[PDB]
RNA sequence: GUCUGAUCAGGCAUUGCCGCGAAGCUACAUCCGCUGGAUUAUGGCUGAACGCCUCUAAGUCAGAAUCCAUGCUAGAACGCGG
C-alpha cells in the first residue's frame, strides 16, 4: 500500500534516493531507508508517500518503518526523546564522568563492583547526555537522534554489564529503568 | 728392567706408564621473548512482521584464548633490484 507523512512550518524533510535527512534545532539526522521494491522517493511538497506494490508478511514490515523513523526523527530533532537508566550499586560508591571536560566523546564507570581499573566506552553523535540535577541515581540520554540517542544506553549498559560476578547478588550494575 | 763403553748424561717401552694445571670447546649454564584486523554465543538500541510489544524485514551498535596479524627465513607464482 501508501501512507502519508508531513512536516510541520519549521522542520524540513528531504528524502533524497535512501538517504533522509530531517531538519530540527537541535541538529539534522540522517539514516538510511530502503527496502525491496518500495520507494520512499516521492516527496509531495509537504506529504513524503511511501509506496510499493507489492505485500508479504517481511515484505509489509519496511512499508511502516519507513513511514514510522520519518515521524520518530522530527520527534527527535525538534523535542529530544528522553532514554532512562539508573547507575545502581551495593556498597562501593560507583563513580561517573560525563561527556564535557575530561570526557572527549566518552563516558567512564570507575568503581564497578570493586574496580581499581575502569571499564570505559566512547560515545555515538551529537548527544547531550544529562547526568544529574546536583546528584541523582538517574543518567538520562537527550540528543538530536532517536537511535544515536539511547546508543548511549547501549554503550553503557554492556560495557559494564555484571558478567564476572554475579547480577543475582552483587547490586552494581547500570540497568535500564524504562524505554 | 735394559741399551747408548762404563760411571754419567740421556732414550725407547709398559694406555696420556701411573700422579697434577692452563690452550680449544661446553653445561650441571648464561641471555631473551605478544600488533592491528575480522566476528560468535550473549546483552541491547531505534523500530517491524502484528493497533500493543520485542535485537531484523528497512535501520543501527557494543562484543571471546582460538580466529587473525604483529616478530624472524624466502626461484614475481616469494632471493625484492640499483
Same mark, same amino acid.
Not at 111 to 116: H, P, Q, R, S, V
Given at each position: 500500500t501508501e501512507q502519508q507523512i508531513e512536516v510541520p512550518e519549521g522542520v524540513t524533510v528531504s528524502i533524497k534516493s535512501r538517504i533522509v535527512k530531517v531538519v530540527g534545532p537541535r541538529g539534522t539526522l540522517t539514516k538510511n531507508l530502503k527496502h525491496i +521494491? =518500495?520507494? *520512499?522517493? /516521492? @516527496?509531495?511538497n509537504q506529504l513524503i508517500k511511501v509506496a510499493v506494490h507489492n505485500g508479504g508478511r517481511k515484505h509489509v514490515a519496511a512499508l511502516r518503518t519507513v513511514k514510522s523513523l520519518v515521524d520518530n526523527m522530527i520527534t527527535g530533532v525538534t523535542k529530544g526523546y528522553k532514554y532512562k537508566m539508573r547507575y545502581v550499586y551495593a556498597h562501593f560508591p560507583i563513580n561517573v564522568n560525563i561527556v564535557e571536560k575530561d570526557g572527549a566523546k566518552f563516558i567512564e564507570v570507575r568503581? *564497578?563492583?570493586? +574496580? /581499581?581499573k575502569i571499564r570505559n566506552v566512547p560515545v555515538r553523535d551529537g548527544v547531550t547526555i544529562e547526568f544529574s540535577?546536583? =546528584? /541523582?541515581?538517574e543518567i538520562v540520554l537527550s540528543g538530536n537522534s532517536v537511535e544515536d540517542v539511547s546508543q548511549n544506553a547501549a554503550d553503557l549498559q554492556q560495557i559494564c554489564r @555484571?558478567?564476572?560476578?554475579?547480577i543475582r547478588k552483587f547490586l552494581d550494575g547500570i540497568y535500564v529503568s524504562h524505554k
Open positions: +521494491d =518500495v520507494t *520512499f522517493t /516521492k @516527496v509531495n568503581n *564497578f563492583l570493586g +574496580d /581499581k540535577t546536583n =546528584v /541523582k541515581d @555484571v558478567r564476572n560476578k554475579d
